[PDB]
Design a protein around this ligand. Structure first.
Ligand SMILES: O=C(O)c1cccc2cc([B-](O)(O)O)sc12
Ligand SMILES: [Ca+2]
Ligand SMILES: [Ca+2]
Ligand SMILES: [Zn+2]
Ligand SMILES: [Zn+2]
Length: 229
């Protein structure tokens, strides 16, 4: 029951939650998928992660316009790499307020990305400092520690069973942790387990590069990351 709009695929996960999937056309290689989320919060919409490109990101917004027809209040993007912040200019062109870890914003130039307009900061226990995430509705933002990158954050959707691991979590049948070029191999396993512990009741785990999985994705990612040490 998936829907396509241009280059994007949408899947409804819950009454008020959809997964957006965008594809990098990677000369000579297969299209590479990356997933994010769209959340309807009463009379507004909230977005987690851009698509790979600005053009693809404008497609997300147009699909929202057509299928949900509520204003998009804000987006949270989950680290400074192309699949998560590639479409920043498109969000800003559309007048969507954007939030990212302060560290994502600092790293953004050196990663080729455009910084968000607002910086999230985090306590020692990983939870976002609430003053930096005003009016986030059901979005619960958690920094689990360095793993896939030093800046990677995660989001839980209150009132649902869903939590989003972004590129930190890989699916439970995975044979590898994907792109480790900017990874913290020492702390990765702890950071994956911290995500699990922050959202103990989530039973649907959404991630960047596989279809939604159960909590098995968390423990399997940790067990793989254990061997990086
Ligand atoms: O950056 C790119 O051009 C790129 C090109 C092809 C694959 C990927 C995967 C990425 B991630 O965030 O999952 O570390 S970034 C990336
Ligand atoms: Ca751009
Ligand atoms: Ca890099
Ligand atoms: Zn990445
Ligand atoms: Zn990724």
């Amino acid at each position: 029951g998936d829907q396509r709009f241009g280059d994007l695929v949408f899947r409804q996960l819950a009454p008020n939650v959809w997964q957006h999937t965008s594809y990098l056309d990677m000369p000579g290689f297969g299209a590479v998928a990356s997933n994010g989320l769209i959340v309807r919060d009463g009379g507004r919409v909230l977005v987690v992660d851009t698509a790979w490109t600005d053009d693809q990101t404008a497609q997300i917004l147009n699909w929202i316009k057509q299928e949900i027809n509520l204003p998009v209040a804000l987006a949270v993007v989950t680290h400074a790499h192309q699949d998560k912040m590639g479409g920043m200019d498109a969000l800003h062109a559309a007048g969507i307020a954007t939030y990212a870890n302060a560290l994502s914003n600092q790293l953004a130039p050196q990663e080729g990305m455009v910084a968000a307009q607002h910086s999230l900061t985090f306590a020692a226990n990983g939870w976002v400092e609430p003053a930096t995430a005003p009016n986030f509705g059901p979005l619960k933002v958690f920094y689990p520690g360095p793993g896939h990158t030093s800046d990677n954050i995660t989001v839980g959707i209150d009132g649902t069973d869903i939590a989003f691991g972004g590129c930190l979590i890989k699916d439970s049948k995975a044979k590898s942790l994907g792109n480790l070029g900017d990874a913290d191999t020492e702390h990765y396993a702890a950071s994956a387990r911290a995500f699990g512990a922050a959202f103990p009741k989530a039973s649907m785990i959404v991630m960047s590069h596989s279809a939604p999985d159960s909590r098995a994705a968390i423990t399997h990612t940790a067990r793989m990351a254990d061997k990086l040490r």
